[PDB]
Amino acid sequence: GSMSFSGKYQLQSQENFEAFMKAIGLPEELIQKGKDIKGVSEIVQNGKHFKFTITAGSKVIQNEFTVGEECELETMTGEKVKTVVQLEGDNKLVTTFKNIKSVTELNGDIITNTMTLGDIVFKRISKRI
Numbered sequence: 001g002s003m004s005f006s007g008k009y010q011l012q013s014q015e016n017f018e019a020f021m022k023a024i025g026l027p028e029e030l031i032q033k034g035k036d037i038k039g040v041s042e043i044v045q046n047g048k049h050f051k052f053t054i055t056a057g058s059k060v061i062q063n064e065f066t067v068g069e070e071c072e073l074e075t076m077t078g079e080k081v082k083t084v085v086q087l088e089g090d091n092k093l094v095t096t097f098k099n100i101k102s103v104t105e106l107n108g109d110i111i112t113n114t115m116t117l118g119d120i121v122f123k124r125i126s127k128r129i
Contacts, residue, residue, distance in 0.1 A: 004045070005043055006044055007043060009041065010038060010040055010126065010129060011038050011039040011124075011126055012126045013124075013125040013126075014039075014122070014125070015122045015123055015124075016120065016122045017031070017035065018031040019120045020115070020120065022120075023118025023120045024077075040055055041055070042055075048066060048067055051063070051064050052064075052065060054076070056076055065085065066085075067085040068085070069084075070084035071084075081098035083097055084096055091105075092105055093105075100115060100116060100117065102114055102115055109127050109128035110125055111125070111126050
């Protein structure tokens with residue numbers, strides 16, 4: 001196995017974005033702010049350990065995660081949750097949250113993310129640049 005899991009993707013289409021904020025209890029100010037900010041997520045890969053980046057309004061976060069083992073990353077709510085990254089297939093990533101089931105898959109240049117919050121589930125679509 002030898003693939004390049006290090007690229008860049010720019011937000012394209014989204015479904016009920018503010019819904020995800022209302023689920024957590026976010027005002028329109030933050031929703032209107034985030035909506036004014038492009039949601040770009042960079043993926044870093046290095047043998048096995050992959051580096052992640054969070055652009056919550058320019059600000060960036062440096063953290064390293066390893067697959068096969070569950071790690072704990074401090075969310076944006078100042079909380080520490082233990083997430084796990086599972087692989088099943090040739091291009092499929094399965095990870096779970098403290099109490100959120102997330103399913104990652106690879107389909108061409110479109111990435112479908114699954115998240116359930118406040119009984120509200122939405123999918124995200126992003127094209128390759």
